[PDB]
């Protein structure tokens, strides 16, 4: 099978930032997919399933009202055109100490071109949970 | 060289409804259902997105189900199904977004019909927090 | 006629307070070498595998304080019998006797070895909802 695939996970050696890595235990890059400048690089044109899940965690609900965002964007090599493919906003606090857990999960099927770069970004890396092995991931599967 | 596939998307113009739009190698979209062209193993998958205005009650239930209509029985059997309670606790009411995913491998027969339905089409949304699709891929 | 190892297992609706996987039932299967032994899927050959699962949780009202629901897909190495997490997700169904429903869907691409055992586990089997078909399943597809 020649179809491009990748499943990348949060690098724990880089806490305070969401840095993706093809970690040895549960992550990989195959059939042309490269990981460059924290982005997944598409080797060929076609329909791809793009997916990601991030887990935020905080202890208590103080000061004001916290906004957690997760975003998947595409950069085409032509004109360096940047477009938002998937995005989601979540507010973990309804006034207030007890810890909260806010997962954000995104996915869809998209037409990608050769050289397309895909990034998966969060606004609050300080809330990212590095507790268990595979809760923070990003991937692409060519159909 | 090739295997039966379909990737159908929902119509944004079909207000308060889940209507699929077009798909290759004999996979046909007929009566808002995917038609299996030949016997074999198929990856069946779907995604729906729901959006509500706020949380006026916690009794709101969202469901999404993929069903098979067998040709030699004409019965509707559940292949994949999910239930979600989008609201916990009830101020200016803020919209919520909830995607539901389904997917599995099934042995299907020539002429089997597959439908992908939701209980709350009034909540169906086309924002970037998800996508609205249904598909089959022959393995 | 597909030669690739595949499997789609479903939960036993008769195994009270447990997550026990079954095949040969109505719309479940094991094909091209995939075996079900000790509640785990057994890999027949080295390669990349599409791994997916769904569990549904149901509770009547919100007791204790805040309950954490988790779903984890693990790789049990054939050599050292080491258990490693591949995919994992957490959910907080209670936000401080009325029923709530929480589905957890996991998916990804993984490199597996011949004889690898895959498990799909949950921390609260007492909240599992298998009342109807297609609610709780686990499966693999060789690429
Ligand atoms: C031999 N060929 C077979 C077909 N294959 C392409 C292909 C097509 C469809 C699916 C699929 C299954 N269930 C689905 C549910 C919804 N949408 C799509 C799917 C697929 O599954 C690979 C495993 C997988 C399953 C779910 C997800 C997932 C989908 C959507 C949001 C997410 C958010 C967070 N985490 C995970 C997400 C990610 C990977 C693979 C190419 C090779």
Short mmCIF file of C-alpha atoms and ligand atoms in Angstrom, two decimals:
data_model
loop_
_atom_site.label_atom_id
_atom_site.label_comp_id
_atom_site.label_asym_id
_atom_site.label_seq_id
_atom_site.Cartn_x
_atom_site.Cartn_y
_atom_site.Cartn_z
CA UNK A 1 0.00 0.00 0.00
CA UNK A 2 1.33 3.35 -1.38
CA UNK A 3 -1.25 5.71 0.28
CA UNK A 4 0.21 8.53 2.42
CA UNK A 5 -0.53 8.38 6.19
CA UNK A 6 0.70 10.07 9.45
CA UNK A 7 -0.26 9.98 13.15
CA UNK A 8 1.76 12.42 15.25
CA UNK A 9 1.59 13.10 19.00
CA UNK A 10 2.47 15.97 21.39
CA UNK A 11 6.16 16.01 22.28
CA UNK A 12 6.44 15.94 26.12
CA UNK A 13 10.04 17.17 26.01
CA UNK A 14 8.52 20.42 24.73
CA UNK A 15 5.92 21.23 27.51
CA UNK A 16 4.46 24.77 27.41
CA UNK A 17 4.18 24.43 23.60
CA UNK A 18 2.25 21.95 21.35
CA UNK A 19 5.19 20.53 19.33
CA UNK A 20 4.24 17.47 17.21
CA UNK A 21 6.54 14.47 16.97
CA UNK A 22 6.42 11.04 15.28
CA UNK A 23 7.23 9.47 18.74
CA UNK A 24 8.43 5.82 18.79
CA UNK A 25 5.60 4.34 20.91
CA UNK A 26 2.38 5.45 19.09
CA UNK A 27 3.32 7.81 16.25
CA UNK A 28 4.66 7.60 12.64
CA UNK A 29 5.00 9.18 9.13
CA UNK A 30 4.60 6.94 6.03
CA UNK A 31 4.57 6.99 2.19
CA UNK A 32 5.94 10.54 1.70
CA UNK A 33 4.43 12.46 4.63
CA UNK A 34 7.03 14.71 6.19
CA UNK A 35 6.91 16.66 9.47
CA UNK A 36 8.48 20.15 8.86
CA UNK A 37 8.23 23.36 11.01
CA UNK A 38 5.58 21.63 13.20
CA UNK A 39 3.48 20.91 10.05
CA UNK A 40 2.43 17.75 8.16
CA UNK A 41 3.55 17.96 4.47
CA UNK A 42 1.31 16.31 1.79
CA UNK A 43 3.29 14.30 -0.86
CA UNK A 44 0.44 14.00 -3.42
CA UNK A 45 -2.97 15.35 -4.56
CA UNK A 46 -6.15 13.60 -3.32
CA UNK A 47 -8.84 13.32 -0.67
CA UNK A 48 -7.52 12.99 2.88
CA UNK A 49 -9.13 12.36 6.23
CA UNK A 50 -7.63 14.99 8.58
CA UNK A 51 -8.21 14.53 12.33
CA UNK A 52 -6.96 15.73 15.74
CA UNK A 53 -7.77 15.64 19.44
CA UNK A 54 -6.32 17.88 22.19
CA UNK A 55 -7.01 17.66 25.94
CA UNK A 56 -6.96 20.77 28.15
CA UNK A 57 -6.86 20.63 32.02
CA UNK A 58 -6.95 23.36 34.67
CA UNK A 59 -7.35 23.40 38.48
CA UNK A 60 -10.28 25.69 39.37
CA UNK A 61 -12.12 28.53 37.56
CA UNK A 62 -10.58 31.90 38.57
CA UNK A 63 -10.17 35.61 37.49
CA UNK A 64 -12.32 35.75 34.27
CA UNK A 65 -13.63 33.34 31.54
CA UNK A 66 -11.02 31.23 29.77
CA UNK A 67 -11.31 30.40 26.04
CA UNK A 68 -9.72 27.24 24.58
CA UNK A 69 -9.34 26.94 20.85
CA UNK A 70 -8.13 24.25 18.49
CA UNK A 71 -7.49 24.88 14.79
CA UNK A 72 -6.41 22.89 11.72
CA UNK A 73 -5.21 25.07 8.79
CA UNK A 74 -3.81 24.38 5.29
CA UNK A 75 -1.05 26.32 3.40
CA UNK A 76 -0.97 25.64 -0.40
CA UNK A 77 2.40 26.27 -2.12
CA UNK A 78 0.65 28.49 -4.79
CA UNK A 79 0.58 32.08 -3.42
CA UNK A 80 1.22 30.50 0.04
CA UNK A 81 -2.60 30.48 0.47
CA UNK A 82 -3.63 29.82 4.10
CA UNK A 83 -7.14 28.64 4.87
CA UNK A 84 -8.84 27.39 8.10
CA UNK A 85 -10.08 23.81 7.47
CA UNK A 86 -11.43 23.00 10.97
CA UNK A 87 -11.70 25.05 14.22
CA UNK A 88 -13.57 24.85 17.54
CA UNK A 89 -13.95 27.16 20.61
CA UNK A 90 -14.72 25.96 24.18
CA UNK A 91 -15.28 27.75 27.52
CA UNK A 92 -14.41 25.42 30.40
CA UNK A 93 -15.61 27.78 33.15
CA UNK A 94 -19.12 28.66 34.41
CA UNK A 95 -17.85 30.75 37.50
CA UNK A 96 -15.97 29.71 40.78
CA UNK A 97 -10.95 24.52 43.86
CA UNK A 98 -11.70 21.46 41.63
CA UNK A 99 -9.89 20.46 38.35
CA UNK A 100 -11.66 20.61 34.96
CA UNK A 101 -11.10 18.61 31.73
CA UNK A 102 -11.98 20.05 28.28
CA UNK A 103 -11.24 17.88 25.21
CA UNK A 104 -11.45 19.38 21.72
CA UNK A 105 -11.69 16.97 18.74
CA UNK A 106 -11.82 17.93 15.03
CA UNK A 107 -11.96 15.89 11.82
CA UNK A 108 -13.09 15.89 8.21
CA UNK A 109 -12.40 14.79 4.60
CA UNK A 110 -10.59 17.40 2.42
CA UNK A 111 -9.11 17.73 -1.06
CA UNK A 112 -5.38 18.40 -0.62
CA UNK A 113 -2.64 19.20 -3.19
CA UNK A 114 1.06 18.15 -3.46
CA UNK A 115 3.14 20.32 -1.06
CA UNK A 116 0.18 21.32 1.20
CA UNK A 117 1.29 21.99 4.76
CA UNK A 118 -1.17 21.30 7.60
CA UNK A 119 -0.83 22.74 11.06
CA UNK A 120 -2.82 21.87 14.25
CA UNK A 121 -2.62 24.76 16.76
CA UNK A 122 -3.93 25.64 20.26
CA UNK A 123 -4.22 29.11 21.90
CA UNK A 124 -3.47 27.88 25.49
CA UNK A 125 -0.45 25.49 25.60
CA UNK A 126 -0.20 26.09 29.37
CA UNK A 127 -3.49 24.08 29.79
CA UNK A 128 -2.40 21.18 27.54
CA UNK A 129 -2.43 17.88 29.44
CA UNK A 130 0.75 15.73 29.09
CA UNK A 131 -0.53 13.11 31.57
CA UNK A 132 -1.31 9.99 29.42
CA UNK A 133 0.52 8.60 26.34
CA UNK A 134 -2.10 9.25 23.52
CA UNK A 135 -4.63 11.99 24.30
CA UNK A 136 -2.99 14.69 22.14
CA UNK A 137 -2.69 13.65 18.46
CA UNK A 138 -2.91 14.90 14.85
CA UNK A 139 -3.12 12.77 11.71
CA UNK A 140 -3.83 12.44 7.97
CA UNK A 141 -5.05 9.33 6.07
CA UNK A 142 -5.32 9.43 2.29
CA UNK A 143 -8.62 7.87 1.15
CA UNK B 1 -7.45 -1.93 -10.60
CA UNK B 2 -10.33 -0.40 -8.47
CA UNK B 3 -12.89 -0.97 -5.65
CA UNK B 4 -16.37 0.52 -4.92
CA UNK B 5 -16.34 3.86 -3.02
CA UNK B 6 -18.65 6.80 -2.07
CA UNK B 7 -18.20 9.99 -0.13
CA UNK B 8 -21.49 11.94 -0.01
CA UNK B 9 -21.98 15.32 1.72
CA UNK B 10 -25.10 16.96 3.25
CA UNK B 11 -27.03 19.73 1.44
CA UNK B 12 -26.85 23.07 3.36
CA UNK B 13 -29.97 24.33 1.46
CA UNK B 14 -32.21 21.45 2.75
CA UNK B 15 -33.43 23.35 5.86
CA UNK B 16 -34.05 21.19 8.97
CA UNK B 17 -33.10 18.04 7.03
CA UNK B 18 -30.17 15.62 6.36
CA UNK B 19 -30.10 15.24 2.55
CA UNK B 20 -27.02 13.62 0.99
CA UNK B 21 -25.41 14.85 -2.29
CA UNK B 22 -22.86 13.34 -4.83
CA UNK B 23 -19.15 8.09 -5.62
CA UNK B 24 -17.57 5.39 -7.97
CA UNK B 25 -17.35 1.73 -9.18
CA UNK B 26 -21.09 0.93 -8.82
CA UNK B 27 -21.79 2.74 -5.46
CA UNK B 28 -25.02 4.62 -6.11
CA UNK B 29 -26.89 7.21 -4.04
CA UNK B 30 -30.60 6.33 -4.32
CA UNK B 31 -33.56 7.45 -2.13
CA UNK B 32 -31.04 9.34 0.19
CA UNK B 33 -29.33 5.90 0.73
CA UNK B 34 -26.02 4.35 -0.37
CA UNK B 35 -26.51 1.19 -2.54
CA UNK B 36 -23.94 -1.64 -2.27
CA UNK B 37 -22.97 -2.86 -5.83
CA UNK B 38 -21.33 -6.19 -4.84
CA UNK B 39 -20.83 -8.55 -1.89
CA UNK B 40 -17.77 -7.88 0.31
CA UNK B 41 -16.13 -6.07 3.22
CA UNK B 42 -16.83 -2.34 3.45
CA UNK B 43 -15.55 0.47 5.70
CA UNK B 44 -18.71 2.50 6.50
CA UNK B 45 -18.23 5.94 8.09
CA UNK B 46 -20.04 9.21 8.82
CA UNK B 47 -19.88 12.54 10.60
CA UNK B 48 -22.63 14.99 11.60
CA UNK B 49 -22.37 18.36 13.37
CA UNK B 50 -25.02 19.74 15.81
CA UNK B 51 -25.41 23.34 17.02
CA UNK B 52 -27.80 24.60 19.68
CA UNK B 53 -28.54 28.23 20.73
CA UNK B 54 -27.83 27.64 24.42
CA UNK B 55 -28.73 25.21 27.20
CA UNK B 56 -32.40 25.89 28.23
CA UNK B 57 -32.66 22.28 29.52
CA UNK B 58 -30.31 19.29 30.11
CA UNK B 59 -32.90 16.85 28.59
CA UNK B 60 -31.70 17.54 24.99
CA UNK B 61 -30.46 14.29 23.34
CA UNK B 62 -28.65 14.05 20.05
CA UNK B 63 -28.44 10.71 18.18
CA UNK B 64 -26.75 9.66 14.96
CA UNK B 65 -27.24 6.20 13.47
CA UNK B 66 -26.06 4.25 10.39
CA UNK B 67 -28.56 1.47 9.46
CA UNK B 68 -28.53 -1.37 6.93
CA UNK B 69 -31.64 -2.30 4.90
CA UNK B 70 -31.04 -5.92 3.77
CA UNK B 71 -32.48 -6.77 0.29
CA UNK B 72 -33.84 -10.29 1.31
CA UNK B 73 -35.64 -9.03 4.46
CA UNK B 74 -36.26 -5.26 3.89
CA UNK B 75 -35.68 -4.57 7.64
CA UNK B 76 -33.76 -1.65 9.23
CA UNK B 77 -30.94 -2.90 11.49
CA UNK B 78 -28.55 -0.60 13.38
CA UNK B 79 -24.91 -0.98 12.30
CA UNK B 80 -23.40 2.05 14.19
CA UNK B 81 -25.06 4.42 16.68
CA UNK B 82 -24.13 7.22 19.15
CA UNK B 83 -26.17 9.25 21.72
CA UNK B 84 -24.95 12.57 23.19
CA UNK B 85 -26.26 14.96 25.93
CA UNK B 86 -24.92 18.35 24.73
CA UNK B 87 -26.12 20.19 27.88
CA UNK B 88 -24.99 20.04 31.52
CA UNK B 89 -26.31 23.10 33.51
CA UNK B 90 -28.43 26.01 32.09
CA UNK B 91 -27.39 34.91 31.74
CA UNK B 92 -26.81 35.33 27.95
CA UNK B 93 -27.22 31.79 26.43
CA UNK B 94 -24.14 30.78 24.39
CA UNK B 95 -24.21 28.40 21.35
CA UNK B 96 -22.68 24.91 21.62
CA UNK B 97 -21.26 22.72 18.80
CA UNK B 98 -21.17 18.94 18.94
CA UNK B 99 -19.73 16.64 16.23
CA UNK B 100 -20.66 12.88 16.20
CA UNK B 101 -18.49 10.30 14.41
CA UNK B 102 -19.30 6.73 13.34
CA UNK B 103 -17.31 4.15 11.47
CA UNK B 104 -16.83 0.40 11.19
CA UNK B 105 -16.08 -2.63 8.94
CA UNK B 106 -19.07 -4.65 7.72
CA UNK B 107 -19.75 -7.61 5.41
CA UNK B 108 -22.39 -6.32 2.99
CA UNK B 109 -24.42 -7.98 0.20
CA UNK B 110 -25.25 -6.79 -3.35
CA UNK B 111 -28.23 -4.39 -3.17
CA UNK B 112 -27.95 -3.56 0.57
CA UNK B 113 -29.08 -0.03 1.37
CA UNK B 114 -27.36 2.14 3.96
CA UNK B 115 -28.90 5.17 5.57
CA UNK B 116 -27.28 7.71 7.94
CA UNK B 117 -29.85 9.53 10.08
CA UNK B 118 -30.08 12.02 13.02
CA UNK B 119 -32.95 12.58 15.52
CA UNK B 120 -32.49 16.41 15.54
CA UNK B 121 -32.06 17.73 11.94
CA UNK B 122 -33.20 21.17 13.23
CA UNK B 123 -29.75 21.26 15.02
CA UNK B 124 -27.66 20.16 11.95
CA UNK B 125 -24.87 22.70 11.25
CA UNK B 126 -22.25 23.41 8.57
CA UNK B 127 -19.52 25.29 10.67
CA UNK B 128 -15.72 24.47 10.84
CA UNK B 129 -16.06 22.52 14.14
CA UNK B 130 -16.89 19.53 11.94
CA UNK B 131 -18.21 18.40 8.51
CA UNK B 132 -21.35 16.61 7.34
CA UNK B 133 -20.58 13.46 5.34
CA UNK B 134 -21.37 9.75 4.88
CA UNK B 135 -19.28 7.22 2.94
CA UNK B 136 -18.41 3.61 2.08
CA UNK B 137 -15.07 2.19 0.98
CA UNK B 138 -14.62 -1.39 -0.32
CA UNK B 139 -11.65 -3.13 1.44
CA UNK C 1 -12.15 -10.80 -2.47
CA UNK C 2 -10.22 -8.76 0.20
CA UNK C 3 -6.98 -10.39 1.51
CA UNK C 4 -6.17 -7.67 4.12
CA UNK C 5 -6.54 -8.51 7.89
CA UNK C 6 -9.70 -6.77 9.30
CA UNK C 7 -11.89 -7.05 12.43
CA UNK C 8 -15.03 -5.45 13.86
CA UNK C 9 -15.92 -6.68 17.36
CA UNK C 10 -18.96 -5.60 19.47
CA UNK C 11 -19.61 -5.54 23.24
CA UNK C 12 -21.54 -8.39 24.88
CA UNK C 13 -24.97 -7.02 25.99
CA UNK C 14 -25.19 -9.95 28.52
CA UNK C 15 -21.83 -9.32 30.28
CA UNK C 16 -23.16 -7.15 33.16
CA UNK C 17 -20.74 -4.36 34.29
CA UNK C 18 -18.01 -5.50 31.88
CA UNK C 19 -16.65 -4.65 28.43
CA UNK C 20 -16.40 -8.08 26.76
CA UNK C 21 -15.78 -8.08 22.98
CA UNK C 22 -17.54 -10.59 20.60
CA UNK C 23 -17.29 -11.65 16.91
CA UNK C 24 -19.50 -14.15 14.85
CA UNK C 25 -22.51 -12.20 16.37
CA UNK C 26 -25.00 -10.50 13.87
CA UNK C 27 -22.78 -7.69 12.44
CA UNK C 28 -19.31 -8.43 13.90
CA UNK C 29 -16.35 -10.32 12.24
CA UNK C 30 -12.70 -11.42 12.29
CA UNK C 31 -11.15 -11.95 8.87
CA UNK C 32 -7.82 -12.82 7.23
CA UNK C 33 -6.00 -13.97 10.38
CA UNK C 34 -7.25 -11.56 13.06
CA UNK C 35 -8.08 -13.54 16.22
CA UNK C 36 -9.89 -12.66 19.43
CA UNK C 37 -8.12 -14.10 22.48
CA UNK C 38 -8.46 -12.93 26.14
CA UNK C 39 -10.60 -9.85 25.15
CA UNK C 40 -7.84 -8.64 22.81
CA UNK C 41 -7.47 -8.47 19.02
CA UNK C 42 -4.44 -10.47 17.75
CA UNK C 43 -2.37 -9.08 14.82
CA UNK C 44 -1.50 -11.76 12.14
CA UNK C 45 1.28 -9.72 10.35
CA UNK C 46 3.64 -6.66 10.59
CA UNK C 47 2.35 -3.45 9.04
CA UNK C 48 0.31 -0.29 9.33
CA UNK C 49 -3.15 -0.64 10.81
CA UNK C 50 -6.20 1.67 10.93
CA UNK C 51 -7.50 1.32 14.52
CA UNK C 52 -10.90 2.59 15.66
CA UNK C 53 -13.35 2.17 18.55
CA UNK C 54 -16.47 3.57 20.16
CA UNK C 55 -17.89 3.25 23.67
CA UNK C 56 -21.10 4.88 24.96
CA UNK C 57 -21.50 5.92 28.61
CA UNK C 58 -24.84 6.48 30.36
CA UNK C 59 -25.59 7.59 33.91
CA UNK C 60 -28.81 8.61 35.73
CA UNK C 61 -28.10 11.89 37.51
CA UNK C 62 -24.73 13.24 38.74
CA UNK C 63 -23.49 11.63 42.03
CA UNK C 64 -20.24 11.77 44.17
CA UNK C 65 -18.98 15.17 42.77
CA UNK C 66 -17.27 14.86 39.32
CA UNK C 67 -16.82 11.49 37.52
CA UNK C 68 -14.14 10.94 34.87
CA UNK C 69 -14.88 8.62 31.96
CA UNK C 70 -11.93 7.28 29.95
CA UNK C 71 -11.43 5.11 26.92
CA UNK C 72 -8.04 3.72 25.92
CA UNK C 73 -6.65 1.64 23.05
CA UNK C 74 -3.35 -0.14 24.08
CA UNK C 75 -0.63 -2.08 22.19
CA UNK C 76 0.67 -5.15 24.07
CA UNK C 77 4.14 -5.84 22.58
CA UNK C 78 4.53 -9.50 21.51
CA UNK C 79 8.20 -9.66 22.70
CA UNK C 80 8.26 -8.06 26.20
CA UNK C 81 4.47 -8.07 26.95
CA UNK C 82 4.76 -4.33 27.69
CA UNK C 83 1.45 -2.43 27.58
CA UNK C 84 1.61 0.99 25.81
CA UNK C 85 -1.20 3.49 25.19
CA UNK C 86 -1.94 4.25 21.49
CA UNK C 87 -5.15 6.37 21.75
CA UNK C 88 -6.91 7.68 24.79
CA UNK C 89 -9.72 10.14 25.58
CA UNK C 90 -11.26 11.55 28.77
CA UNK C 91 -14.82 12.98 29.40
CA UNK C 92 -16.45 14.82 32.35
CA UNK C 93 -20.21 14.13 32.01
CA UNK C 94 -21.08 16.09 35.19
CA UNK C 95 -20.89 19.92 35.50
CA UNK C 96 -21.91 20.20 39.26
CA UNK C 97 -31.74 11.01 38.66
CA UNK C 98 -31.94 12.51 35.07
CA UNK C 99 -30.01 10.48 32.43
CA UNK C 100 -26.91 11.70 30.59
CA UNK C 101 -25.15 10.12 27.54
CA UNK C 102 -21.50 10.39 26.55
CA UNK C 103 -19.98 8.71 23.45
CA UNK C 104 -16.15 8.39 23.00
CA UNK C 105 -14.83 7.68 19.45
CA UNK C 106 -11.09 6.93 18.96
CA UNK C 107 -9.20 6.44 15.65
CA UNK C 108 -5.67 6.47 14.13
CA UNK C 109 -2.86 4.74 12.07
CA UNK C 110 -0.42 2.51 13.95
CA UNK C 111 2.58 0.33 13.13
CA UNK C 112 1.99 -3.13 14.64
CA UNK C 113 4.03 -6.37 14.78
CA UNK C 114 2.97 -10.04 14.19
CA UNK C 115 1.49 -11.35 17.47
CA UNK C 116 0.68 -7.89 18.90
CA UNK C 117 -2.40 -7.80 21.10
CA UNK C 118 -4.73 -4.79 21.02
CA UNK C 119 -7.04 -3.94 23.87
CA UNK C 120 -9.85 -1.36 24.03
CA UNK C 121 -10.59 -0.58 27.69
CA UNK C 122 -12.74 1.83 29.83
CA UNK C 123 -12.35 2.95 33.46
CA UNK C 124 -16.14 2.83 34.32
CA UNK C 125 -17.81 -0.39 32.94
CA UNK C 126 -20.75 0.34 35.33
CA UNK C 127 -21.63 3.34 33.08
CA UNK C 128 -21.36 1.34 29.78
CA UNK C 129 -24.50 1.44 27.55
CA UNK C 130 -24.93 -1.58 25.27
CA UNK C 131 -28.80 -1.59 25.52
CA UNK C 132 -29.04 -1.33 21.68
CA UNK C 133 -26.80 -2.55 18.85
CA UNK C 134 -23.96 -0.48 17.24
CA UNK C 135 -23.27 1.49 20.48
CA UNK C 136 -19.94 -0.08 21.52
CA UNK C 137 -17.48 -1.55 18.96
CA UNK C 138 -13.70 -2.01 18.29
CA UNK C 139 -11.92 -2.73 15.00
CA UNK C 140 -8.79 -2.80 12.80
CA UNK C 141 -7.99 -2.60 9.07
CA UNK C 142 -4.54 -3.45 7.65
CA UNK C 143 -3.36 -0.82 5.20
C1 LIG D 1 -7.79 1.01 3.09
N1 LIG D 1 -8.35 2.36 3.06
C2 LIG D 1 -9.50 2.46 3.96
C3 LIG D 1 -10.04 3.87 4.01
N2 LIG D 1 -9.00 4.78 4.48
C4 LIG D 1 -9.51 6.14 4.69
C5 LIG D 1 -10.45 6.28 5.87
C6 LIG D 1 -11.75 6.76 5.70
C7 LIG D 1 -12.61 6.90 6.77
C8 LIG D 1 -12.21 6.54 8.06
C9 LIG D 1 -13.18 6.69 9.20
C10 LIG D 1 -13.50 5.75 10.15
N3 LIG D 1 -14.39 6.27 11.06
C11 LIG D 1 -14.69 7.57 10.71
C12 LIG D 1 -15.53 8.50 11.32
C13 LIG D 1 -15.63 9.75 10.74
N4 LIG D 1 -14.98 10.10 9.63
C14 LIG D 1 -14.16 9.19 9.07
C15 LIG D 1 -13.95 7.89 9.55
C16 LIG D 1 -10.91 6.04 8.23
O1 LIG D 1 -10.59 5.64 9.50
C17 LIG D 1 -9.21 5.49 9.89
C18 LIG D 1 -9.20 5.38 11.40
C19 LIG D 1 -9.75 6.63 12.04
C20 LIG D 1 -11.08 6.68 12.46
C21 LIG D 1 -11.65 7.88 12.87
C22 LIG D 1 -10.90 9.06 12.89
C23 LIG D 1 -11.55 10.38 13.17
C24 LIG D 1 -12.48 10.86 12.27
C25 LIG D 1 -13.05 12.12 12.41
C26 LIG D 1 -12.72 12.92 13.46
C27 LIG D 1 -11.78 12.48 14.44
C28 LIG D 1 -11.46 13.26 15.58
C29 LIG D 1 -10.61 12.76 16.50
N5 LIG D 1 -10.01 11.56 16.41
C30 LIG D 1 -10.29 10.82 15.33
C31 LIG D 1 -11.18 11.19 14.29
C32 LIG D 1 -9.55 8.99 12.53
C33 LIG D 1 -8.99 7.80 12.11
C34 LIG D 1 -10.04 5.92 7.15
C35 LIG D 1 -7.91 4.75 3.51
C36 LIG D 1 -7.32 3.35 3.44
#
